[PDB]
Amino acid sequence: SALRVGTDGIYPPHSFHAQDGRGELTGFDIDLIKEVAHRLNLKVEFFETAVSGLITGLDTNRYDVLVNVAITPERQKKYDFSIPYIAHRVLLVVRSDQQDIRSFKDLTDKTVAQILGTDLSRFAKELKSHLVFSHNFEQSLQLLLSKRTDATMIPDIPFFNFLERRPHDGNLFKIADRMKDNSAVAFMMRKGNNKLTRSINEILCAIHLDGTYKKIFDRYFDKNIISSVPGCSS
Amino acid sequence: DQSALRVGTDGIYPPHSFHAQDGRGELTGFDIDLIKEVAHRLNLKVEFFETAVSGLITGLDTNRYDVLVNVAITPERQKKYDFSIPYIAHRVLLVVRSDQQDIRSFKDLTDKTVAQILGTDLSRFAKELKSHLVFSHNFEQSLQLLLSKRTDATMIPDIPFFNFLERRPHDGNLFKIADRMKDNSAVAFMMRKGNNKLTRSINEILCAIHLDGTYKKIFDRYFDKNIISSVPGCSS
Ligand SMILES: C[N@+]12CC[C@H](CC1)[C@H](OC(=O)C(O)(c1ccccc1)c1ccccc1)C2
Numbered sequence: 001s002a003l004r005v006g007t008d009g010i011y012p013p014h015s016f017h018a019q020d021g022r023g024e025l026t027g028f029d030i031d032l033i034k035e036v037a038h039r040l041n042l043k044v045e046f047f048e049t050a051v052s053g054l055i056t057g058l059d060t061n062r063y064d065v066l067v068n069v070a071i072t073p074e075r076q077k078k079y080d081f082s083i084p085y086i087a088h089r090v091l092l093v094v095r096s097d098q099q100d101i102r103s104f105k106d107l108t109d110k111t112v113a114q115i116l117g118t119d120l121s122r123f124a125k126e127l128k129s130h131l132v133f134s135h136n137f138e139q140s141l142q143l144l145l146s147k148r149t150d151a152t153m154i155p156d157i158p159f160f161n162f163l164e165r166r167p168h169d170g171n172l173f174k175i176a177d178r179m180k181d182n183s184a185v186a187f188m189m190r191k192g193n194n195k196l197t198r199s200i201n202e203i204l205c206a207i208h209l210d211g212t213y214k215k216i217f218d219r220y221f222d223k224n225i226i227s228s229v230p231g232c233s234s
Numbered sequence: 235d236q237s238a239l240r241v242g243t244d245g246i247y248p249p250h251s252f253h254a255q256d257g258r259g260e261l262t263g264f265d266i267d268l269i270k271e272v273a274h275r276l277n278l279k280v281e282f283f284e285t286a287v288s289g290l291i292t293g294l295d296t297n298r299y300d301v302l303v304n305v306a307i308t309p310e311r312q313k314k315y316d317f318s319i320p321y322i323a324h325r326v327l328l329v330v331r332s333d334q335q336d337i338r339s340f341k342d343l344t345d346k347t348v349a350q351i352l353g354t355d356l357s358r359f360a361k362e363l364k365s366h367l368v369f370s371h372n373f374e375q376s377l378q379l380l381l382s383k384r385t386d387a388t389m390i391p392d393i394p395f396f397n398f399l400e401r402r403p404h405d406g407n408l409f410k411i412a413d414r415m416k417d418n419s420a421v422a423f424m425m426r427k428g429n430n431k432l433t434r435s436i437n438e439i440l441c442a443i444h445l446d447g448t449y450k451k452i453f454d455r456y457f458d459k460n461i462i463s464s465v466p467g468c469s470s
Pocket residue numbers: 007008011014015051054055066067068069070115117118119120469
């Protein structure tokens with residue numbers, strides 16, 4: 001019957017509410033999982049939760065799938081993932097006037113804005129940055145803009161979304177560094193949920209093959225900036 | 235390396251899987267080096283079984299081995315087998331002789347003679363296009379059938395075709411690419427359905443191999459990163 005999906009509806013263009021937060025859930029990952037669910041003959045139900053609680057919610061069995069999850073070996077050990085459906089690259093973003101920060105290594109004893117309970121937040125911790133925890137990507141950039149923090153590490157997808165939405169507020173940023181590799185992103189389910197995993201994968205390959213994915217992708221991304229994943233065949 | 239990972243392969247397909255010293259030595263290739271690598275990190279030793287392409291799936295089905303390499307992900311295969319996270323991607327090309335005029339797309343292959351390997355999806359696609367098939371033993375023979383005018387076309391992934399130009403460059407000018415699939419294709423290891431633990435393990439190890447530079451090393455050993463596409467990395 002239902003596909004229970006955990007998400008946080010304040011992260012454009014992944015997952016957000018239409019009409020400036022007033023309307024239904026929308027976004028790339030939302031449109032895709034809605035699509036997956038329709039083909040599997042399921043009604044989708046979304047549960048809204050802060051990012052810091054999303055994995056906790058999946059562990060607690062409040063829902064069955066998470067969207068927009070970076071594949072890591074730690075997570076691979078402990079959860080099931082679909083085939084990757086997108087890829088992002090991590091950027092170090094500073095204000096355009098910033099001088100002292102040129103690499104990830106320079107973040108030590110700088111104030112950095114990150115989201116509580118994320119890998120980037122943990123990376124910031126290991127670097128011995130001074131963390132300021134923001135509720136989302138919009139607030140990270142806003143903290144940076146108003147000089148409350150000196151840097152943020154942010155995937156390319158939300159950062160470019162921000163420049164698209166607020167362009168004349170965009171040239172106030174510079175990219176100081178980027179990870180050498182881009183990162184596979186997939187749906188995450190609990191381990192030992194193999195049937196649902198195979199099903200999503202089946203359907204994702206169908207969505208590659210019939211042009212639906214290109215439509216959902218073009219709806220949200222500039223294929224000149226945002227990387228995708230290899231297709232499926234027949 | 236005191237318990238075995240049984241791998242089915244055909245060792246006449248450079249640069250995926252082939253024998254060193256012009257076919258006379260140990261099994262080698264991108265897919266071979268990667269699965270060997272996977273197996274060492276899993277504390278297994280690898281055992282390879284060589285089989286003609288037409289028989290590989292049957293061997294996995296009858297339990298003579300546990301994994302096939304270089305397998306394109308298809309929804310039919312997804313329905314019936316387990317796959318790892320994609321570790322490479324190829325693109326299908328239509329290759330013709332450089333002088334060829336009448337072939338501009340896949341659709342033009344109807345009633346053309348085409349060279350393909352028996353028991354491949356491209357062979358079945360050739361069938362459906364109402365082409366006249368000449369069955370070759372491998373990619374080298376497909377290109378050779380084309381070269382000597384026994385066939386008019388072959389459909390070949392980019393990876394072996396470019397390997398061929400690397401090995402025999404002075405023969406490069408005899409071929410042209412008439413068309414390519416609009417999408418590239420994910421390629422993975424294929425296991426039998428039901429062994430989820432081995433699947434997760436390979437995936438774990440592949441992501442580790444992304445992260446420590448080993449994948450870059452194996453890839454650069456075999457491919458031109460300006461021609462051949464790869465898959466996104468992992469994070470941590
Ligand atoms: C590097 N890292 C590590 C943890 C996480 C995945 C990748 C994080 O990114 C995120 O903020 C989420 O992907 C997210 C983003 C928008 C909407 C919903 C969720 C997320 C966070 C924690 C758990 C799952 C997803 C940055």
